[PDB]
Amino acid sequence: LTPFFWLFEEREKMMEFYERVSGARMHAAYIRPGGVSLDMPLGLMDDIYEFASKFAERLDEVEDVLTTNRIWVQRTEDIGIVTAEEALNYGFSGVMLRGSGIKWDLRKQQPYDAYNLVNFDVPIGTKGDCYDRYLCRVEEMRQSLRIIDQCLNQMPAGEI
């Protein structure tokens, strides 16, 4: 229980940010064909900065608690091995695929948004377990964080 609750504390901060821009907790309509529906309120940049500032602490607290824990490790590790070939022929993708070993990802290969202007590395596993898949998700959180660093630092002015 404790991991879920500690993280759902921080989920509240992020939803508040969605609320700040769009006006809805979830289910914004903020992204629209001609770009985003609306501009951003001033200062939301800074609040994002402190939130990102603290998120490393929060994520590490749960990470140190739960990644190494024997019960969790044995409870997930070597569960449902997903071999590489079997993964492809079944039409997988995402961190599942990326965990099984395939070095594929849509951001790096078929970039669609400003990801051209951000440098970062995806995580990859080599065991195809639920555990190393879980690790891949955890490292993805960390890597996304630096992506916010790049973008939020370089944000240009202009129309929206």
Q: Is 88 in the site for another protein (CB under 8 A)?
A: yes
Give the pair of three-digit tokens for residue 77: 């590790």
Q: Examine residue 33 and tell whether it contacts another protein (CB under 8 A).
A: no
149 binds another protein (CB under 8 A): yes
By CB under 8 A, what part of segment 120-139 binds another protein?
121-128, 132, 135-136, 139
Q: Are strands 31-32 and 35-36 parallel, antiparallel or unpaired?
A: antiparallel
Where does residue 158 fall: left (phi above 0), alpha (psi -120 to 50 degrees), or beta otherwise? left
Burial code (b: 16+ CB inside 10 Å, e: under 16) for 63-79 equals beeeeeeeeeeeebeee
Q: Does 84 bind another protein (CB under 8 A)?
A: yes
Interface with another protein includes 80 (CB under 8 A)? no
- For 32, phi then psi, to 5°, come to -135, 165
Q: How far apart are CB 110 and another protein at their closest, in Å?
A: 7
Count of residues near another protein by CB under 8 A: 94
DSSP labels, 17-74: HHHHHHSSSS----EETTEESS-PPTTHHHHHHHHHHHHHHHHHHHHHHHTS-HHHHH
Q: Which of residues 90-109 bind another protein (CB under 8 A)?
A: 90-93, 100-104, 108-109
Q: Does 74 bind another protein (CB under 8 A)?
A: no
Among 14, 69, 75, 78, contact with another protein (rule: CB under 8 A): 69
Instruction: Give yes or no for residue 114 binding another protein (CB under 8 A).
Output: no
CB of 82 to another protein, least distance (A): 7
Contact positions with another protein (CB under 8 A) in 35-64: 37-47, 49-50, 52-54, 56-58, 60-61, 63-64
Cα–Cα dist 51/71, whole Å: 31
